Symmetry: none
Subunit: 75 residues, 6 copies
């Protein structure tokens, strides 16, 4: 006679921590900003940011991905 | 005689923590901003942000993805 | 004689925490913002934000996604 | 003239994780236990536990305690 | 003239992780236990544990304690 | 004129990790235990533990303690 016992077990842990975690920013101060523009000419897309204090966190990453394939074939 | 026992078990844990988590911003201060513009000419899209203090979190990422395939074939 | 026992088990846990979580902003302050414009010409779409303090969280991500395929074939 | 501005601020965070957290037990096994008693004499309290596999978590601790005193006195 | 501004700020973090955390126990096995007792005499309390595999976590500790005192006196 | 500005800031982090954390125990095995007792006499408290594999974590410690005193006196 024959017996097959197919019992793979996944007990893993997976963690991702991405971007800005647990930081302290203490009394941060931006300076005065002046922009003077005269007679400028633009023939294409203009993309502009003017500020004094910017805090930017950008996270395209940090996803957790599992691909698993299981397979049993008899005769 | 024959027996097959197909019992794969997933008991795992998956976590993502993405963007800005648990940060302290204490008295952050933006400065004065002046923008003066004269006689400018634009022939395509203008995209403009003017501010003093910006705090920005952008998260296209941090998704958890599981793909699992199971298969048993007898004769 | 023959027996097949097909009982794959998913007991796993999945979590996503995406964007801004548990942050403290204590007394954040934007400065004065002045924008002066004269004789400007725009020949396509203008997209503009003028402000002083902006707090922005954008989350296109952070979705949890499961694809699972099961298959049993006898003769 | 006189001004007083009494504004103490508590923004702190307090966490306890006490006992048995996030452990994995995989296929633990207790052995055979045989207890034979004859002609025994007991003249005060008997407290008995007989088993094979015991898993025990006892937490008298892990409590979070805050005591805060505020006081403002003028003349 | 006079001004008093009284603004102590608690922004701290406090964490305890006490007992058994994040451990793996893989196939732990207790052996056979035989206890034979004959003609024994007990004239006070008897406290007994008999087993094979015991897993025990006891946590009287891990409590977070904050005591804070604030005081303003004018004349 | 007079001004007082009383602003102590606590931005600290405090962490305890006490007991058994992140350990791996792989196939630990207890042996056979035989206890034979005959004609023993006990005239005060008996405290007995009989086992084969004991795993014990005891944590009276790992508590975090903050005591803070603030005080302002004018004339």
């Amino acid at each position: 006679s024959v017996q097959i016992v197919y019992k793979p077990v996944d007990l893993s842990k997976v963690t991702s921590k991405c971007g800005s975690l647990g930081n302290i920013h203490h009394k941060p101060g931006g300076g005065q900003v002046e922009v003077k523009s005269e007679k400028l000419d633009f023939k294409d897309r203009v993309q502009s940011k003017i500020g004094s204090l910017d805090n930017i966190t950008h996270v395209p990453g940090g996803g957790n991905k599992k691909i698993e394939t299981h397979k049993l074939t008899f005769r």
